[PDB]
Amino acid sequence: TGQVSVEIEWELQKENSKRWNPEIQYTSNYYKSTSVDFAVNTEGVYSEPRPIGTRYLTRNL
Amino acid sequence: VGNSSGNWHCDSTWMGDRVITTSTRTWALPTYNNHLYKQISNSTSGGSSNDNAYFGYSTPWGYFDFNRFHCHFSPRDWQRLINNNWGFRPKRLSFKLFNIQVKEVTQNEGTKTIANNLTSTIQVFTDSEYQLPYVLGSAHQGCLPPFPADVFMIPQYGYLTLNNGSQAVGRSSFYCLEYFPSQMLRTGNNFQFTYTFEDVPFHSSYAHSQSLDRLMNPLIDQYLYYLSRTQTTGGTTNTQTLGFSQGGPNTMANQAKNWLPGPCYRQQRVSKTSADNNNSEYSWTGATKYHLNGRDSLVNPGPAMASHKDDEEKFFPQSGVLIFGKQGSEKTNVDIEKVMITDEEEIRTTNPVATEQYGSVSTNLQRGNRQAATADVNTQGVLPGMVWQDRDVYLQGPIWAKIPHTDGHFHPSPLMGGFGLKHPPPQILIKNTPVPADPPTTFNQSKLNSFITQYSTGQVSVEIEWELQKENSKRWNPEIQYTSNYYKSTSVDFAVNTEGVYSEPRPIGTRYLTRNL
Amino acid sequence: WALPTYNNHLYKQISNSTSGGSSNDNAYFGYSTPWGYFDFNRFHCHFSPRDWQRLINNNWGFRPKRLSFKLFNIQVKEVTQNEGTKTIANNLTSTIQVFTDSEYQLPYVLGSAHQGCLPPFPADVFMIPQYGYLTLNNGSQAVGRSSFYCLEYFPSQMLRTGNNFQFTYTFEDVPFHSSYAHSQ
Amino acid sequence: TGQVSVEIEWELQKENSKRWNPEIQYTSNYYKSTSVDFAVNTEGVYSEPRPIGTRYLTRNL
Known part of the structure; x- marks a missing residue:
């Protein structure tokens, strides 16, 4: 056995949109939940609430 | 104030392989909604x-x-x-x-x-980053006067977003250019700027000297063979057999070719002669269309196609091509005589005909007890081995269009024809500056709504430097050309009647000169 | 913006009057x-x-x-x-003619959130709210120590059409307002 | 009358939090609404849907 790691250097095109109206975003809803999100239940098993997309920010066509 | 802001530079000149051009024209400017914004859906419906x-x-x-x-x-x-x-x-x-x-x-x-x-x-500005919804590529009337001496007003401006009937979604956006830098401008002070295109495939303005099925030699035969017999033919008896043969000058139809015709979309046909069309309103029902997000929309002008085959001058695609209207035409239900249609006989060379099947294929595998299956194909995608020519452009037509900034685009050649770009020329927008009327003597929380209605005007021009591949063809026989017929006509062409209205006789194509395939 | 005259270029006194x-x-x-x-x-x-x-x-x-x-x-x-x-x-x-007070000798008017701020919106237009201050008072009467100012006593870049005017200032040290919540 | 403008140059301390769980954010809800947010009704009057706070991102105490 043993441990390993991996490094990844990426590139990214930051947004330049001048849309005035506040776009949509990704967030954990603010209401109260018994079991947090992406947390680990009292047992230690780690689970995800929902799948996650990336097409969130709206850019002009 | 006492000095012109420049001279009227409007000419056409040819220095060789390049061509410069500019056109001066005088415009006008009206305010709108009294400097107010709006919301539009099934409202003024x-x-x-x-x-x-x-x-x-x-x-x-x-x-x-x-x-x-x-x-x-x-x-x-x-x-x-x-x-x-x-x-x-x-x-x-x-x-x-x-x-x-x-x-x-x-x-x-x-x-x-x-x-x-x-x-x-x-104040005006430009969008060199294309953050504003592009409005062109829609061929909206109000282009610079096809004529130079007339004058015109500048069409107002409005865009749209992702919608759901009479309601919008959350992701719907909303912009306001009042958020952009703009060379302010007072009378007497001038404004100009400059941009340069990028690499683009020269739109080939010519026809072909051969068709996809006649590119071989007539005096010889392919050294290959093809299926020519399924049954015997020697008297009064039928039995399973196989006769193979080469491809000769007399059986050219069967000879194995190497390339393939272009892509297609079947469309209903129609006639210029009123009585030859079925008597049923299928303008919207029997029309070719696509389905997207529930909203069914027509497919016009659709992909590149051929208007008709030989001598079918009576017909054309239901919604497969462009149409123009002589000057003086109104908005709806006008007849065929107030309009002009586009002839596309130039592509029968390589592309299919809209009102025609793409071809046939089989649906089964026969045996001595199973009959030979054969279906039809009216819908066709592309495969390795195809070649075509995009829609030809017209003088009274569009020039370029904005390529959608996406991850996937293929042979982005626009459908109306023209040129595409990942970074198209820019959009320039102007408006009369607001100037309020006499305000109250005391304070009032609310903003103002009373202004001096006014308008502004002036002249503008644009320079365009192009590239051109001059012909090198050694065809001996005198090609065809474009000319105004030599007979006598009461009203000249592209002239102005005794009233001054300027109108065009017919639409104009470019695929005139024939170059070898 | 826009600009209206006031009281026909005249001053005033205000207490339980236009009450x-x-x-x-x-x-x-x-x-x-x-x-x-x-x-x-x-x-x-x-x-x-x-x-x-x-x-x-x-x-x-x-x-x-x-x-x-x-x-x-x-x-x-x-x-x-x-x-x-x-x-x-x-x-x-x-x-x-306009001017500025880099010495803060005039009663400050902001910090009162009075309407008439620049349009939250950019395309609209607005009028500039008139101006008025106050002093130490006693009901409908003022005290001796009450003061009275008149800006017509201050230098002001005069201004005619076509001629522009601008100026510049820079803040000083301030604790970054922490825009966040706490995890405990 | 006439037009004016003002320039403001600020400073900002970008976040360094290594919270693993996805924090909360500010966004216009994704459902459908007849009148957009911070838009202008068919009349041109510009209005705001709700007031806006800034204490959104959670940093450790």
Whole structure:
């Protein structure tokens, strides 16, 4: 056995949109939940609430 | 104030393999919604159609519309171009704007005096980052006057977003250019800027000297074989057999070729002769269309296609091509005589005909007890081995279009024809600056709604430097050309009747010169 | 923006006058001056919504350091109200004058969130709210120590049409307002 | 009358939190609404849907 790691250097095109109206975003809803999100239940098993997309920010066509 | 903001530079010149052009024209500027924004959906309506639902905003601003050709080339010159070169591509683009003036208007008792208010202003800008919804590529009327001496008003401006009937979604956006830097401008002060295109495939303005099925030699035969017999033919008896043969000059139809025709979309046919069409309203029902997000929309003009086959001058695709209207035409239900249709006989060379099947194929595998299956194909995608030519352009047509900034685009050649770009020329927008009326003597929380209604005007021009591949063909026989027929006509062509209205006789194509395939 | 005259270029005195009736709690004493001023002490006046958002979801704190100010394209209109028929033209030869108080000798008016801030929106237009201050008062009367100022006592870049005016200032050290919550 | 402007140059301390769980954010809800947010009704009057706070991102105490 043993441990390993991996490094990844990426590139990214930051947004330049001048849309005035506040776009949509990704967030954990603010209401109260018994079991947090992406947390680990009292047992230690780690689970995800929902799948996650990336097409969130709206850019002009 | 006492100095012109520049000279009227409007000419056409040819220095060789390049061509420069510019056209000066005089415009006008009206305010809108009294400098107020708006919201638009089934409101100032039509009633209920997920297909005719929209959502946008009318802004107090205006913009320029010159995405056509009859706006940069007088007819004759265009002609010059046609009969001598095979292809071209626009490289440079300049823009000048000057001689601004400001008028105000007091409508007292119907008596209105119009003088100038030399101290007012305006502001314009450009979008070199394309953050604003592109408006062109829609061929909206109000282009620079096809003519030079007339004058015009600048069409207001409005865009749209992702909508759901009469309601919008959360992701729907909303912009306001009042958020963009803009060279302010007062009378007497000028404004201009400049941009340059990027690499683009010269739109080939020529036809082909051969068709996809006649590219071989007539005096010889392929050294290959093909299936020519399924049964015996020697008397009065039928039995399973196999006769193979080569491809000869007399059986050219069967000879194995190497390439393949272009892509297609079947469409219903129609006639120019009223009585030969079925008697049923299928304009919207029997029409070719696609389905998207529930909203069913027509597919016009659709992909590149052929208008008709030989001698079918009576027909054309239901919604497969362009159409034009002689000057003086109105909005709806006008007849065929107030319009002009586009002939596409030039592509039968390589592309299929819209009102025609793409071809047939089989649906089963026969045996001595199973019959040979054969179906039809009216819908066709592309495969390795195809070649075609995009829709030809017309003088009274569009010039380029904005390629959607996406991850996937294929042979982005626009459908109306023209040129595409990942970074198209820009959009320039202007508006009259707001100037409030007499405000109250005390304070009032609310903003203002009372202003002096006014308008402004002036002249502008644009320079375009292009590229062109002159012909090298050694065809011996005299090709065809474009010319005004030599007989006598009461009203000249591209002239102006005794009234001054300027109209075009017919639409104009470019695929005139025939170059070898 | 736009600019209206006031009290026909005249000063005033104000206490339980153009009133309410009797309240040592609603007693005041001030002066309405023919002058006007600027009101932009808010945020929806410098940040469109979206952008503000951008700011929020990425940074913890911030502090404004630099501040510039430009002002131009002035025009002058006059008004003749004859028989209800009023022609509005311009009088390009008239003028105005503005100044600034870098010594803070004038009663500060902001910090009161008075309406009339720059339009939260950019395309609309607005009038500039008149200006008036107050002093130490005693009901409907003032005290001896009450003061009385007149800016007509201050230098002011005069200004005629076509001529521009601008100036500049820079903040000083301030604790970045922490825009975040706590995890415990 | 006339036009004016103002320039403001600020400073900002970008976040360094290594919270693993996805924090909360500010966004216009994704459902469908007749009148957009921070838009202008068919009349041109511009109005705001709700007031806006800044204490959104959670940093450790």
